[PDB]
């Protein structure tokens, strides 16, 4: 609301790059943690079997 199309565009581009970096770091770190969880889940299924 405070900004007009041109610099609203550039600032929102900086902010969406920042949020994309944050969400991509979240997704990649959660993929790593999901690989850890999947290794633990394969271990759990191995113990179950």
């Amino acid at each position: 609301s405070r900004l007009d199309p041109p610099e609203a565009e550039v600032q929102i581009d900086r902010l969406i790059t920042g949020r994309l970096q944050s969400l991509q770091t979240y997704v990649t770190q959660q993929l790593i943690r999901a690989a850890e969880i999947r290794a633990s889940a394969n271990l759990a299924a191995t113990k179950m079997s």
Binding site: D4, P5, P6, E9
Partner: protein, 48 residues
């Protein structure tokens, strides 16, 4: 593919309003360039 040469006049000030998104009364009501503009702007001198 195709070339359109827009032609109009504006004061010495508010010439920066001839730009994609740049606000102003002329840009708000008279002539608004698209945000994804592609071309050259030539504000060649007309004091005469």
């Amino acid at each position: 593919t195709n070339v359109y040469a827009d032609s109009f006049v504006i004061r010495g000030d508010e010439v920066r309003q001839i730009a994609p998104g740049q606000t102003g009364k002329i840009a708000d009501y008279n002539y608004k360039l698209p945000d994804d503009f592609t071309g050259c702007v030539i504000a060649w001198n007309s004091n005469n």
